[PDB]
Amino acid sequence: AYTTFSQTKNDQLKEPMFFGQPVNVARYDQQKYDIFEKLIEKQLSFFWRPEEVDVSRDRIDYQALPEHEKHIFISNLKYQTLLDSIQGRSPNVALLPLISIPELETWVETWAFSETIHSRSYTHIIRNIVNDPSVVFDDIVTNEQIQKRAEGISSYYDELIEMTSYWHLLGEGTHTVNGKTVTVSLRELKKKLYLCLMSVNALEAIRFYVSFACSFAFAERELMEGNAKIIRLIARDEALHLTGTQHMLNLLRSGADDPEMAEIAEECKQECYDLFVQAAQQEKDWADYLFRDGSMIGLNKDILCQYVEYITNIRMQAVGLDLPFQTRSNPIPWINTWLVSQIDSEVDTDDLSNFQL
Amino acid sequence: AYTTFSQTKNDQLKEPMFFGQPVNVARYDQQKYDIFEKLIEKQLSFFWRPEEVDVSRDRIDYQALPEHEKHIFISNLKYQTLLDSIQGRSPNVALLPLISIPELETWVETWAFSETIHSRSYTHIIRNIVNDPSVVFDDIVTNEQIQKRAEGISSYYDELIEMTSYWHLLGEGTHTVNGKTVTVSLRELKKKLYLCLMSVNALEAIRFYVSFACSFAFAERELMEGNAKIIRLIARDEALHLTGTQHMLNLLRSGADDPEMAEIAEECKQECYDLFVQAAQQEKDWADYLFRDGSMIGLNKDILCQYVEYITNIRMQAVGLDLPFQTRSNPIPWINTWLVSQIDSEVDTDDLSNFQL
Amino acid sequence: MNQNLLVTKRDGSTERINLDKIHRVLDWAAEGLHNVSISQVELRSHIQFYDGIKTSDIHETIIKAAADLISRDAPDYQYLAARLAIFHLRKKAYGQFEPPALYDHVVKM
Ligand SMILES: Cc1cn([C@H]2C[C@H](O)[C@@H](COP(=O)(O)OP(=O)(O)OP(=O)(O)O)O2)c(=O)[nH]c1=O
Ligand SMILES: Nc1ncnc2c1ncn2[C@H]1C[C@H](O)[C@@H](COP(=O)(O)OP(=O)(O)O)O1
Numbered sequence A, B: 001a002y003t004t005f006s007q008t009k010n011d012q013l014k015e016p017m018f019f020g021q022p023v024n025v026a027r028y029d030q031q032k033y034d035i036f037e038k039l040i041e042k043q044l045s046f047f048w049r050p051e052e053v054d055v056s057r058d059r060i061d062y063q064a065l066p067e068h069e070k071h072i073f074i075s076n077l078k079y080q081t082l083l084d085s086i087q088g089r090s091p092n093v094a095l096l097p098l099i100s101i102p103e104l105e106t107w108v109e110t111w112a113f114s115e116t117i118h119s120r121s122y123t124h125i126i127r128n129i130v131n132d133p134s135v136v137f138d139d140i141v142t143n144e145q146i147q148k149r150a151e152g153i154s155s156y157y158d159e160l161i162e163m164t165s166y167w168h169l170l171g172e173g174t175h176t177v178n179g180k181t182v183t184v185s186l187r188e189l190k191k192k193l194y195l196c197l198m199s200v201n202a203l204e205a206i207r208f209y210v211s212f213a214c215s216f217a218f219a220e221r222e223l224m225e226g227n228a229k230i231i232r233l234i235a236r237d238e239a240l241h242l243t244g245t246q247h248m249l250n251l252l253r254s255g256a257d258d259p260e261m262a263e264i265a266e267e268c269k270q271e272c273y274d275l276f277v278q279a280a281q282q283e284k285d286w287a288d289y290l291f292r293d294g295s296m297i298g299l300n301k302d303i304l305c306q307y308v309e310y311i312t313n314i315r316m317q318a319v320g321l322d323l324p325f326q327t328r329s330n331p332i333p334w335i336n337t338w339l340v341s342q343i344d345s346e347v348d349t350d351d352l353s354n355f356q357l
Numbered sequence C: 001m002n003q004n005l006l007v008t009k010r011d012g013s014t015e016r017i018n019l020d021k022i023h024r025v026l027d028w029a030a031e032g033l034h035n036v037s038i039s040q041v042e043l044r045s046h047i048q049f050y051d052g053i054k055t056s057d058i059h060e061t062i063i064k065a066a067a068d069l070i071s072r073d074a075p076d077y078q079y080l081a082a083r084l085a086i087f088h089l090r091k092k093a094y095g096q097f098e099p100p101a102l103y104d105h106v107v108k109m
């Protein structure tokens, strides 16, 4: 079963990323994969608090927005609050019982903590642009266009948590639980972990970046600029997050960490492809809901759907998946601002005479 | 089972601290108990990094120490690395699947995150005073004098984690798992949560404060002052941590949050007393190992054991437990410094004649 | 890097520095007193150890240290520092703690 401090003295450098011996002593002088140690130092260096950003002017801009632009902005904010609500708790609940090297354990905890700062900043933004924040928060759980993807995203986490609990309680093998037969396969647990990380990669590298386009499109019009500063800080963290999941996925896929994992990654390549395609298709439908009542300067259904295809191809190639959409140039190049970062008068008559006209 | 985003739209202000509906939407505009929101804001404001502390002089002081004072310092450092190693992951693993209000969920993640900075600072201190840190870290798991105390603390976490897995997979009731009968009692689960929180309170409010005395005793002699600067920042965090476990325990014990919990607290009152007293005796035993090779100016076995009994009475009274030791004045009063932030020449002859000699 | 320092006893002889001797003396003097601290006296002494340090200079320093802790909050230090000083005066005059017989002393004096 899971232990918070395993008694065995293991060489933490030879453990795998997941399913090895639970981490005991937390040391940071050495790493098996130093990508996670760098992600920790970089996330610690980015530490910000929401209240340090002035969002008071954003209230005036919001009230002046057209009715359908209030809708576009506030719907993207509820979806953001939702996704980072899941991201606040889920990496800690789903990954900590599986991690077996210290540098990856601490990164996941730092990753999750930094997400709670995002959740706090959404509360900060909401309470500074609307009159009753309860109106926005109460709509997040019941919203038709949100709850479809909320339960879809949480399921990959939930199913991984469930199999992890059986694996700790019962161990591998064929078991009987209240008459019914229950099979606990570590290979099927490694499969749920891989599929979950793929879903999280699509969540943070595609779903959120579609949201960044909406938040920053208002900022290119010098509107909602306090929100833009916070979303810009969130985007800087979000690049660190997806890099972590990219390195996890590629280390698992390449068999560097677990020889068994290389085959499991290949048996999932079709599910992972359909997973990303589904996510991309869901955001295009979400884009269809945003502009249901009209568009704004710089952003409509076509533009946002084009960015969906653009950002999706980039992310999927980063994890070794086939590109599902046509090749395309960046439809919103302006988004990159927010995501990255006399005379020498002497003569020589001799040298001139050395010349025939 | 546990879900990372529960579908039900519930009034989070009316949920209990634990075992209620798993938190869905993360909001911070309102709280049921604002103590945890204040602890979050206070922990975020204390955010510090180990590298911002000058520890260069500490390498010289350490090498100059007597051989047995090297023992005292490095043994207290290994024990610290151990305790905050558990504390890095354990509140996230053992409490997150049980919390049902958002302000407590985010505090536990902030609490756990701040512990990883402690774990990193221990790596910072170690790698700046010894030549091969691997010698120090490898002794934490294998040295027989340390790991004995590790399993005492980790067990309360492990047993709570296990029952939580059964409670999510099987639910409450009498079950059969591989023939053998398995009973899942929520009342016995609330009992394991309460006992675990009691163990953590003794860990952070007694065990670590005994360790603080050693680090600061070197500093009262102007030695190891870089370590002392870091331990002082850690002590400021540890004061927030024990405040969290105290408020949880007292809210549970008074039945204010869960009426059923009030009686469960009374069925544990004897176990919790023996739990705290045991911790004090274990730390008193640890002091005998520190000074097995000699003492130093201002600190020996008796002085530190007196502080153990002194601080234990205070902590146990704070959570409604009987005092197990005799009343005593603070044996080390210097520790409180580190654990908190002509003639008017005019005469009147007529007035003088109005006088009888 | 242990140096193994030496202290000079009252009879001129030398031995390894042993802090438990200081612990016992202070614990003896603080017995029965309220709101005093052996640890406080030792740390506030700021006693500078050098090889060959006189044992009388060590004791005279901790007397001054405990004497300066006499306060309203900790009044019993008036008795801690007194017992350390009475102990010091016994050695200065007799070489031990127990005084000689009344007759033997008058004869010598
Ligand atoms: C006077 C007295 C002293 N003491 C304590 C105070 C001293 O620490 C110790 C007596 O001091 P000493 O007999 O001088 O012992 P010491 O530890 O200095 O060793 P030595 O001189 O042999 O190297 O006992 C008592 O316990 N009871 C008493 O009545
Ligand atoms: N080996 C040692 N190292 C350091 N200090 C010592 C010591 N032995 C005794 N002391 C201290 C404790 C007393 O406060 C002080 C006077 O002690 P003492 O018993 O009067 O002298 P001594 O033992 O030298 O005859 O010296």
Ligand SMILES: [Mg+2]
Residues within 6 Å of the ligand: none
């Ligand atoms: Mg003596």
